[PDB]
Amino acid sequence: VISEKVRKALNDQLNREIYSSYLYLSMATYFDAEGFKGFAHWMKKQAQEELTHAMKFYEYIYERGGRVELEAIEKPPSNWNGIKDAFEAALKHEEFVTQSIYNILELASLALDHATVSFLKWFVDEQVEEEDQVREILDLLEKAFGQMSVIFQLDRYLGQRE
Amino acid sequence: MVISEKVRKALNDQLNREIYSSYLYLSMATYFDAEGFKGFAHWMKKQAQEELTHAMKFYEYIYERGGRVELEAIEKPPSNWNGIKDAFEAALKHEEFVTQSIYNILELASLALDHATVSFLKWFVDEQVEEEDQVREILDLLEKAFGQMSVIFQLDRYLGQRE
Ligand SMILES: [Ca+2]
Ligand SMILES: [Ca+2]
Ligand SMILES: [Ca+2]
Ligand SMILES: [Ca+2]
Ligand SMILES: [Ca+2]
Ligand SMILES: [Fe+3]
Ligand SMILES: [Fe+3]
Ligand SMILES: [Fe+3]
Ligand SMILES: [Fe+3]
Known part of the structure; x- marks a missing residue:
């Protein structure tokens, strides 16, 4: 029922x-090497969350009668020059993901695909x-x-993510 | 008492x-889901998660021994097989090679006199x-x-129940 161009867009996402x-798991390997157990735990939780989102796209594609094709996963960076540098990269990464989501939302709207628009809304948010x-x-x-004081406060706080 | 670099390399490769x-395994799920075998698809998803839990077991052991993990590129997997059996044959061939891999590291750790790493690999070997x-x-x-469709489908329901 879903259009091929919109199915391709969801598969890319x-x-x-x-x-x-x-x-994120690669970011975990960096924080763990630097001894920041709380940051690494947070990254590992984030990796798990992103996997659940991928699986959400997976099952929606099959619900609309399409098909999932898994592509090569490129080697992620494994080193950053500081906690700030790592989170700068995460933000740059995340801004790009949001843009990609916005563009799929536009493609679905031009296709008049109500379900797909609704599906992507939760991810936009x-x-x-x-x-x-x-x-x-x-x-x-x-x-x-x-001041390291603040860096350890944040390691502790993020290390509590459920 | 920190692990040697070669024992580190081999655990990171594994x-x-x-x-x-x-x-x-997730790619096999894409195939079974497309072919319409929800039960086989479910089993492959469970297996894919389990393999991740094994990867993370290696991850945390490497850091416990004062090594570090480096993530490499993940090759694109096959997305199609010519039949339910063709898929499971590739699964067995894959697991067979993983078994030899685990035993290879087990001997390498023994050679390196790393009893901690030999004992860790024991659970995975088993x-x-x-x-x-x-x-x-x-x-x-x-x-x-x-x-026989009748038996193939009964297999689908069976594996479909994996918790
Ligand atoms: Ca979140
Ligand atoms: Ca292709
Ligand atoms: Ca993302
Ligand atoms: Ca746009
Ligand atoms: Ca198992
Ligand atoms: Fe996401
Ligand atoms: Fe995200
Ligand atoms: Fe395994
Ligand atoms: Fe395995």
Whole structure:
């Protein structure tokens, strides 16, 4: 029932979620190497969340009578020059995902595909919220300047993510 | 007491092979879901998650021994097979090779006098053999069905119940 161009768009986004999951796990490998157990735990939770979103795209594609094709996953970066540098990359990554989602929303609307528009709305909202969470983290980091006190507070807080 | 670099390399290689395995199994789910076998598809998704849990077990052991993990590119998996049996044959061939891989690391760790790593791999060795034999039992059932839709579907319901 879903148009091939819209199915292709959802399949591209599914693969982007997978890569996104992988980047975060790679961010985990960096924080774990640097001894920040709380940051690494948060990244691992984020990787798990992105995987659940990919699976949401997976099952929606099959619900609309399409088919999922899994593409190569490129090697993610594994090193950053500081906690701030890592979260800068996450924000840059996340802004791009949001843009991609917006563009699929436009493609579905031109196709007059109501279901797909509705489906993507929840992800639009989740992406906006994630972007802001990363921004608030970077604001805290920039305002702390170097003070390790704030960096350990944030390791503790994020290490509690359920 | 931190792990040697070669034992580190091999565990990290195995970590990445558990990641590909998890992705391969998910790709098999895309095939069964497209062919209309919800039960087979469900089993492959469970297996893909389990392989991720194995990858993360390697992940945390490497850091416990003061090593680090490097994630490599994940190759595109096959997305199509010529039949239910063709898919499960590739699954068995994959798991067979993983079994030899685990035993290879086990000998390398012993050679390196790394009793901690040898003891860690024991659980995986033991579980790798069990699940290689579970995949062969499935594949054997489908060959003894030959054509029979009736038995293929009963397999689909069976694997569809995996918790
Ligand atoms: Ca994402
Ligand atoms: Ca293709
Ligand atoms: Ca646009
Ligand atoms: Ca979230
Ligand atoms: Ca198993
Ligand atoms: Fe996502
Ligand atoms: Fe995201
Ligand atoms: Fe395994
Ligand atoms: Fe396996």
